[PDB]
Amino acid sequence: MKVRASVKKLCRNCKIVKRDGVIRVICSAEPKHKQRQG
Amino acid sequence: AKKVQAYVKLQVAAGMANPSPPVGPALGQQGVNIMEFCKAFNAKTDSIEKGLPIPVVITVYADRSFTFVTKTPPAAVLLKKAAGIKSGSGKPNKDKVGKISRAQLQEIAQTKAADMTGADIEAMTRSIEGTARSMGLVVED
Amino acid sequence: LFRRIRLKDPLKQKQLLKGLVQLSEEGAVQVFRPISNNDLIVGAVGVLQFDVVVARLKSEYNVEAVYESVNVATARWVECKDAKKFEEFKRKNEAALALDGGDNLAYIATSMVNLRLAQERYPDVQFHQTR
Amino acid sequence: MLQPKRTKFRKMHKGRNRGLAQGTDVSFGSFGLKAVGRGRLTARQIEAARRAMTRAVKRQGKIWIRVFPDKPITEKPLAVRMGKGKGNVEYWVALIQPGKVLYEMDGVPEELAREAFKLAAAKLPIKTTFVTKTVM
Amino acid sequence: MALNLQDKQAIVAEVSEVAKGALSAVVADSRGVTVDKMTELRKAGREAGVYMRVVRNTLLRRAVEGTPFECLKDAFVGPTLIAYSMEHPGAAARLFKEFAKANAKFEVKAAAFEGELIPASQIDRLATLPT
Amino acid sequence: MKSSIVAKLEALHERHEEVQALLGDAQTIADQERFRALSREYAQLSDVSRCFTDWQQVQEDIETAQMMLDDPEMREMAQDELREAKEKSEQLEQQLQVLLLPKDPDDERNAFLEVRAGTGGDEAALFAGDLFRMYSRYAEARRWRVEIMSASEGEHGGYKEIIAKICGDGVYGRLKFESGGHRVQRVPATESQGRIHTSACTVAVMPELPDAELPDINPADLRIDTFRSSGAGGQHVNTTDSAIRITHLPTGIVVECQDERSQHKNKAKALSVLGARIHAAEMAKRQQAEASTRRNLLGSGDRSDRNRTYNFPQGRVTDHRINLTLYRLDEVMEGKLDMLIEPIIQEHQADQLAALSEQE
RNA sequence: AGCCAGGAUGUUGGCUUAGAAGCAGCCAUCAUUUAAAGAAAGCGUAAUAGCUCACUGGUCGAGUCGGCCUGCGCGGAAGA
RNA sequence: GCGGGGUUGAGCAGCCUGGUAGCUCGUCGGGCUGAAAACCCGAAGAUCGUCGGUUCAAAUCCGGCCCCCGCAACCA
C-alpha cells in the first residue's frame, strides 16, 4: 500500500473506489499498484 | 491441429554439417542425440543445393522418435546468395547497402510462395518484394 | 569428488605426509600429486569416507588439515605398451597428468566429456579405471 | 539556462506584477501553454520545463519559448544585517501576468503535445492550461 | 467499425455478389482458427479467387437489410451467426460439399447444413450438383 | 617464435573441440553462467581454429607436394602446386594476423611513454635519446603526435629521463610490450679505449587514464552535526552552537570546524576542507597506484632485467619474452618497429585466449 | 461494459549478440489471408516460447463517453 | 571586509601621467677542451592574469571576476 497525496491509476486493471471518505486505488492484477490518499 | 511440444527454429546453412555453435544445446537439451539431426537432415540437404539455411522441426515425443518437414527457406539468408551483397542494413531509410531490380525478386515468387498464403501470385510476390524494403535493399521501378 | 589440502600452517607437513601415506597404504583414501605443481589433492570414493579420514587425521596425526579448495577432477590410470607414443601423450597433457602412490601415472580429467575426448585421441594408450 | 548577455545596469527594483499579459495568442506554432495564474518564472524553471518537453517529444517538431528571464533578483548573503547596500544577483526571472503564453510547439500530434505540456507544467510554480492556435 | 458511409458501401458490394452469383453453402466459423481460414480460402483461390464473400454480420439489420431486393428468403438467417459461400462460375458448383468435409476437419459445427434456398431447400445434404 | 605459436594454436584447436563437446552436453546450459562465457570462448576460438586447420592442411599439402616432386616424374605439376601452396600459406598467415588483431577498447587509448637511463650513465642517457627518436619516428610514420611533457638532458648528450605523451589511434595496444628493461651492447662514444660496454635502460609505457573528476558533495551523503564550540566568549559562545562536524559516510572522513562565531562560516570552511581532503585522498590513491604500476613495469636498471637486447657490433635484436632474433638494427633504428611489435601482439592475444579458456 | 471464440502469416523484418524471434537496445513499423488481427502494448524466458492484450463477429436491447463555464464539499493537514 | 601583486621558460624592474618591453639565470648556433663543465662571440623571445567600458589608441584609465601575500574577524 502506497500512502500518497496524489493517487492515480497505474494500469488497465486499477480501479478507483472511495472508502470511508478516502480515495483509494485497488488493482486486481498487480499488488504493487494499490494506493490510498493520505 | 496439434500444438507445439518442444520444437524450435534456429540453424545455420546446410554446408556446415552438425553445427555446434548456432543451436548449442538447443537440440542437445532433450533426449535426442547430436548425431540424429545430422543423419536425418543433411542426407536430404544434398539432393538439390547446399549452403542455404533451412529450418527443421525439433519436436520430441515419448517414444524417442520424431518427425520433420522443411518449410520455404527464409528470405533474409536467401537474399545474400541471390543479391550479390553479403552484409545487412541498419539504417534503411537513410542509406542503401545495394540495389536490386524488379525481375530479380519476381523470379523467387514461383519457388517460394508455396508456403505463403495469398489469393494471387502478385499478392504473395509483393510480400517478397517488401522483404528487400525491410532489408534496406532498394528496387528500381 | 577430489579436494585439495591447503595446509594453512606451513610446518607439520612431514606429519601430514606420514599420515597421508599411511591412510593411502590402507584403502580408505587415495592421494594424488600433479607433476606440474606441488599440490596435494586427496580423493576418496565417498563424502563420508573423507569425513572419517579427516576425523582420524585430527584424532591421532593432529594437523589442522584445511581442505575443500575448489578443483574438478576424475582419475584414470594411464598405461601404454608402445614406446615413443606415451612420451607424446605426456607432453600433450602434462598439466592434467598427476602421479599416484606406487609411482603410477594417472590422467586427471576436468570433465567426463574431457575424459571421453582424451579417450578418443591417442588410442594406443590405454586408460584403466582400476589399477 | 537563459540569461542576458549584457545589461545597462546590474540591479533592478523589486517592482509590482499588476495588469494583464500581452502575448495572449499562439503566434508561431500550433499549440501553446498559457498561464492562468500570476507570478515570476525563474531561469532554472524555464530550463527544466524546456528539457522536459523536448525529451517528451523526442526532439521532433519545433518549440518556441515566448518568455525570457530578464529581471535580476538579488538577495543578501547568509547571516548579515539589513543595511550595507543591496545584495548580489543570484538568479534571473521573467514577470508573468495572467494569459501569457509561455511556450509554443508544433510538428507533433495533439495528444503528444498534451502530455509534453503537462510534464512541462508539472515543474512550474504557476498554474497553466493548454491552448491551440486560432485563426484571426 | 467506421461510419454509415462505409457501412452502405460494404453492403452494396456485399449483396452484389449474391445478385450476380449462384447457390451458396453455410458455415459458422466461430471456433475456426486463422490457419483454417488460410487454407480453406487458399483452396477457394484456385477457381477464381476472392469472388466468394465471407462478409458476415448477422445482426437483425446489419446484413438482413439487403435480402428483400434479391433472394428474399435469406431473412431466416437472422438469429445465430452463419455465413454463405458464393459461387460465381457455375450454378451449384462442387465447392458446396467443402463444409461437409470440414465438418469432421476440426470444425464440428457446420452451421446446420441447410444451404442457400435457391431450390427452396431445408435440412438436407444436397448432393445433386451439375458438372 | 613460429614453433611456439603453432603449438599454442594446436592447444587452442583442442580447446575449441572441447568447448563444442561441452556445449553439446547441455549440462553447461543448466549451469547458465558457465555456458554464457563458454559460448563467447567458442566464438573467438572458432574463426582462428578454422583458419589454423586450413593452414594445417596447406602444410601437409606442401609435404606431399615435395614427395610428389621427387619420384613419379610429376615434378612440374608438383612445383606449380607447391608454389601455389606457398602463396596460400602466406595469405592464411596474414589472415591469422587479422583474426588475432586486438579488439580491446582500452588499447585505442593514448599513452605516456617514459624512457629512463639505468646502468651506463651518460651512455644510457644517449641510448634513451636513441630510443626516444626510434619511438618518435615510429609514431610519425603511423600519424601520431609526440608531445615532450618533461625532459632531463644528459651531460654528454642524450636525455637522462624523458617523458612524452603520444596521441593517436591504437597507441596503447601498439606500445604496451615495450615496457621493461632494454639492454644495449655497443662501443660507447664516451669510451676512449675502444672497449665494448653493456648498458641497460628502463622504459615505462602507461595508458592515459580517464580525466579526474571532482564529484560535488551530496547533501544526503553528508551528516552535519552542530555542537557548542570550546573556549572563551561568554553567554553567546555557550548558547550558540557555532561548531560544525561533517562526516562523509562513504569515505569515512570527519572534518570539525569551530573557528568563526557564525555557524554558516564554520560550515562553509568545513565543507571546503572536506572537499579538499576528498580530492587529496583521490589524488594520493591515484599517485600510489600510478607509482606501483610504474615500479612494476620499470626494471631494476641492472642488465639482468631485460625485454629486448640490441647488439650493435653484430647488428642483432633479440626479444626475450618470446624467442625472436633479427639480424638488422638499422631498419629498426629508423622507425619500422612493426616487424618486432606484431609477433608479440599475436602471441599475447593467444595467451589471453588460453587464459580465458582456463578461467572458471 | 460483461460472455464466448479468435488475434495466423511472410519473417526469426534488417542489425550485433555469446543469445536478440515483439521486448538489451539502433532504423524501418511494409505486405497477405480482408467480417479485423497488430514487423505487435506489456508480463514473461537464459533467447524462443506461453499468458493478458490494440482490433472482428452473435448475446441481452437503452443510452453511453470525456472535455468546457460554474456553486458548494474530500484527501494533501504532524507538537509539545 | 581592507591594502599590495599577476610582466619572455623561472625570479624580478619599468607600467607614468595613454603612442616606447628591460635585467640575471635559462634557450639556440658557432668558438675553446681529446670530450663534458667554466669561459668567449652572435642571436631570439611576451595578447604585461580574465572580461566589459571611456578614447583615434589601454599592459597603463575605470568597473566586475579568479589566484597569490599580508591585516582584521573583538565586548558578550
CA dihedral C115, C121, C127, C129 (to 10 degrees): 20
Residues whose CB is less than 8 angstroms from the CB of residue D116 and which lie 6 or more positions away in sequence, other chains included? D52, D53, D56, D57, D105, D108
CA distance F184 to F334: 16
Please state the φ and ψ torsions of residue C82, each to the nearest 5 degrees.
Answer: -65, 140
In a domain, D82, yes or no: yes
- Which residue range(s) make up the domain with D97? 21-136
Place of cell 491509476: A9
Taking phi first (over 0 means left), then psi (-120 to 50 degrees means alpha), and beta for anything else, what does residue B16 get? beta
One domain for residues B132 and B83: yes
Residue D14 inside a domain? The answer is no
Contact B78, B108 (CB under 8 A): yes
User: What is d(CA B10, CA D65) in angstroms, rounded to the nearest whole number?
Assistant: 53
The verdict on E106 touching B (C-beta cutoff 8 Å) is yes
Does residue D63 contact residue D50 with C-beta atoms inside 8 Å?
Answer: yes
In terms of Cα–Cα distance, which of E19, E27, E22 is closest to E80? E27
Residues F218-240 as b/e (b if ≥16 CB within 10 A, e otherwise) read: eeeeeeeeeeebeeeeeeebeee
The residues with which F324 forms a beta bridge, in sequence order, are F319
D8 min Cα distance to partner chain F (Å): 33
Residue of E nearest to B114 (CA): E42
D interface with F, Cβ–Cβ below 8 Å: 78-79
CA distance D3 to D91: 9
Cβ(D55)–Cβ(D134) below 8 Å:
no
* Candidates E36, E50, E106; nearest CB to B119: E50
One-letter identity of residue F245: R
Q: Helices F33-70 and F338-358, interaxial angle, to 10°? A: 130
**Do residues D100 and D34 touch, judged by C-beta distance below 8 A?**
yes
Interatomic CA distance for residues B8 and C129, integer angstroms:
40
Domain assignment of residue B85, given as a range: 72-141
Residue F274 CA and nucleotide H73 C1' are separated, in Å, by: 23
Nucleotide nearest to F238 (CA to C1'): H76
Q: How far apart are CA F126 and CA F312, in angstroms?
A: 14
Nearest nucleotide to D80, CA against C1' atoms: H1
Alpha-carbon distance of F132 to F119, in angstroms, equals 17
Q: Do B53 and B88 fall into the same domain?
A: no
CA distance B88 to chain F (A): 20
Q: Do chains F and C touch (3 or more CB pairs under 8 A)?
A: yes
- CB-based contact, E59 to chain B, within 8 Å: no
Residues 6 or more apart whose CB falls under 8 angstroms from that of F340 comprise F308, F317, F319, F324, F326, F332
Closest C-alpha among B57, B15, B9 to residue B36: B57
| Residue D41 maps to a domain | yes
List CB contacts of C37: < 8 A, sequence separation 6 or more: none
E92-109 as b/e: b if 16+ CB within 10 A: bbebbebbeebbeeebee
E17, E85 Cβ separation under 8 angstroms: no
Q: Does B28 touch chain F (CB under 8 A)?
A: yes
Distances (CA, A) of C79 to C95, C115, F222: 17, 15, 70
Residue E35 touches chain B, beta carbons under 8 Å: yes
Residue B127 belongs to domain with CATH number: 1.10.10.250
Q: How far apart are CA B35 and CA B39, in angstroms?
A: 6
F247 close to F223: Cβ distance less than 8 angstroms: yes
Contact (CB, 8 A) for E74 and E114: no
Confirm whether any atom of chain H, the nucleic acid strand, is less than 7 Å from CB of F192.
yes
In three-state secondary structure terms, D44 is helix
Structural domain contains residue D77: yes
Q: How many other C-beta atoms lie within 10 A of the C-beta of residue C109?
A: 21
Strand partners, E84: E26
- End-to-end CA distance of chain A, in Å? 11
**If 0-12 CB within 10 Å is exposed, 13-18 middle and 19+ buried, where does residue E91 land?**
exposed
Torsion of CA F206, F212, F218, F223, to 10 degrees: 60
d(CA D30, CA D28): 7
- Give CA–CA dist B102/B104, Å, rounded: 5
How many CB atoms sit inside 10 A of residue F159's CB?
A: 24
What is the C-alpha to C-alpha distance for residues D35 and D96, in angstroms, rounded to an integer?
8
CA separation for the pair F109, E5 (Å, rounded): 68
| 3-state SS record for F159-183 | EEEEEEEEECCCHHHHHHHHCEEEE
Residue A4 assigned as binding residue: no
For chain B, give the longest Cα–Cα distance.
55
User: What is the grid cell recorded at F338?
Assistant: 612493426
Residue type, F23: L
- Residue showing cell 554446408: B15
Q: Which of F202, F149, F206, F147 is nearest to F176 (CA)?
A: F206
From CA F244, how far away is CA F255, in angstroms rounded?
A: 8
Tell me the Ramachandran region of residue F157: left when phi exceeds 0, alpha when psi lies from -120 to 50, beta otherwise. left
Neighbours of E50 (CB within 10 A): 13
Same-domain pairing of B48 and B63: yes
B128 in the same domain as B63: no
Q: In sequence order, what are the residues at sequence separation of 6 or more whose Cβ sits closer than 8 angstroms to the Cβ of residue F24? A: B20, B24, B25, B28, B34
CB neighbours of residue E31 within 10 Å? 10
Distance from the Cα of residue F239 to its chain's centroid: 61
Q: Are E55 and E1 in contact (CB under 8 A)?
A: no
Tally the domains of chain B.
Answer: 2
| B20/F39 touch (CB, cutoff 8 Å), yes or no | no
End-to-end Cα separation, chain C, in angstroms: 18
Domain boundary among B16, B36, B71: B71
Count CB-CB contacts under 10 A for residue F177.
Answer: 20
B141 and B79 in a common domain: yes
Find the closest chain C residue to F8 by CA distance.
Answer: C92
The CATH number given to whatever domain includes residue D31 is 3.90.1170.10
Taking the CA of residue D93 and the C1' sugar atom of nucleotide H47, their distance in angstroms comes to 37
CB atoms within 10 A of CB C104: 14
| Positive/negative CA dihedral, B17, B23, B26, B29 | positive
- The partner residues of C127 in beta bridges, in order of sequence, read C78
**Known binder of ligand: residue A11?**
yes
Considering only CB atoms, which residues of chain F are within 8 Å of chain D?
Answer: 262-265
Q: Does residue D128 belong to any structural domain of this protein? A: yes
Nearest residue of B to residue F41 by CA position? B21
Task: HSE, CB side, 13 Å, CA atoms: give it for residue F193.
Answer: 3
DSSP E strands, C1-131: 3-5, 30-34, 41-43, 67-69, 75-79, 97-100, 104-108, 126-128
Q: F137, F104 in Cβ contact below 8 A?
A: no
| b (16+ CB within 10 A) / e for F73-97 | eeeeebeebbeebeebeeebeeebe
* C128 strand-pairing partners: C77
Cβ within 8 Å, pair C117-F22: no
Report yes or no: B120 at the E interface, CB cutoff 8 Å: yes
Beta carbons of E42 and B118 less than 8 Å apart: yes
Bridge partners, F185 (sequence order): F198, F311
Question: What residue of F is the nearest CA neighbor of C114?
Answer: F18
CB-strand contact F232/H, under 7 Å: yes
- What CA–CA distances, in Å, run from F28 to B12, F37, F134, F136? 22, 10, 50, 50
Distance from CA of F20 to the nearest CA of B (A): 6
- One domain, residues B96 and B130: yes
Angle between helix axes F2-25 and F338-358 (nearest 10 degrees) is 30
Are B32 and B66 spatial neighbours (Cβ–Cβ below 8 Å)?
yes
Q: Among partner residues F26, F43, F46, which is closest to B25 by beta-carbon distance?
A: F26
Q: After which residues does chain A break, using C–N > 2.5 Å?
A: none
Q: Do F35 and B25 touch (CB under 8 A)?
A: yes
Rounded-to-integer distance, Cα F18 and Cα F20, Å: 6
Q: What is the DSSP string of F263-301?
A: HHHHHHHHHHHHHHHHHHHHHHHHHHHHHHHHHHHS--S
Residue with cell 431450390: E119
Asked which of B71, B92, B127 is the last residue of a domain, the reply is B71
Who's near C21: CB < 8 A, 6+ residues apart? C31, C101
Between CA C101 and CA C33 the distance in angstroms is: 9
> Do residues B90 and B120 both lie within one domain?
yes
Whole-angstrom Cα distance, residue C127 to residue C117?
A: 12
Domain co-membership, B24 together with B80: no
Which residues of C fall within a CB distance of 8 Å from F18? 113-114, 117
Partners of D129 in beta bridges: D34
Q: In whole angstroms, how far apart are CA C67 and each of C53, C57, C63, F360?
A: 12, 12, 12, 19
Q: Of C64, C60, C74, whose CA–CA distance to C32 is shortest?
A: C74
DSSP-assigned letter for residue D17: -
- Cell matching residue E81: 451467426
**Using a CB-CB distance cutoff of 8 angstroms, which residues of chain C are in contact with residue F360?**
70
Residues (110-169, chain F) with CB within 7 Å of strand H atoms: 155-156
A14 is in an annotated binding site: yes
Phi (first) and psi of residue F327, to 5 degrees? -85, 60
- Distance between terminal CA atoms of chain D? 34
Q: Which residue is nearest to nucleotide G75 (CA to C1')?
A: A37
B66 and B78 together in one domain:
no
Determine if residue A16 is labeled as part of a ligand binding site: no
Domain-terminating residue out of B26, B43, B71: B71
3-state secondary structure of E67: helix
D9 lies in some domain: no
Among F20, F26, F42, select the one facing B29 at the smallest CB separation.
F26
Grid coordinates representing C13 are 607437513
Note whether B108 and B52 are same-domain residues.
no
> Do the Cβ atoms of B119 and E33 come within 8 Å?
no
**What is the distance between the alpha carbons of residues D1 and D42, in angstroms, rounded to a whole number?**
9
Containing H/E element for F141? helix F122-141
Same domain, yes or no, for B50 and B100? no
**Resolution in units of Å:** 2.8
Decide if D10 is inside a domain.
Answer: no
- Residue at grid coordinates 477464381: E48
d(CA F248, CA F218) in angstroms, rounded, equals: 9
Structure letter (DSSP) for residue E66 = S
Q: Which chains have 3+ CB pairs within 8 A of A?
A: none
**Residues D3, F144: Cα–Cα separation, whole Å:** 42
CB D128 within 8 A of CB D39: no
Contact A19, A29 (CB under 8 A): no
For strand H, the positions having any atom within 7 A of a protein Cβ are 1, 34-37, 52, 73-76
Residue environment code for D89-123, b if the CB has 16+ CB neighbours within 10 A, otherwise e = eebbbbbbbbbbbbbbbbebeeebbeebbeebbeb
How is F72-138 classified by DSSP, letter by letter?
Answer: SS-HHHHHHHHHHHHHHHHHHHHHHHHHTS---TGGGS-EEEEEEE-TTTHHHHHHHHHHHHHHHHH
F241-256 exposure pattern, b = at least 16 Cβ within 10 A, e = fewer: ebbbbbbbeeeeeebe
Distance CA E9, CA E122 (A): 32
List the grid coordinates of C68: 575443500
Are residue B83 and residue B119 in the same domain, yes or no? yes
- Neighbouring-strand partners of residue F224: F246
User: Measured between alpha carbons, how far is B125 from F48 in angstroms, rounded to an integer?
Assistant: 41
The sign of the CA dihedral F230, F235, F236, F241 is positive
Contact partners, residue C72, CB within 8 Å, separation at least 6: C110, C111
CB–CB contact F43 B25 (8 Å): no
d(C-alpha F222, C-alpha F246), whole Å: 6
Within a domain: D104: yes
CB contact at 8 A, F106 and F182: no
- F31 and chain C in contact, CB less than 8 A: no
Cβ count within 10 A of residue F65: 20
Domain count, chain D: 1
What is the 8-class DSSP label of residue C4? E
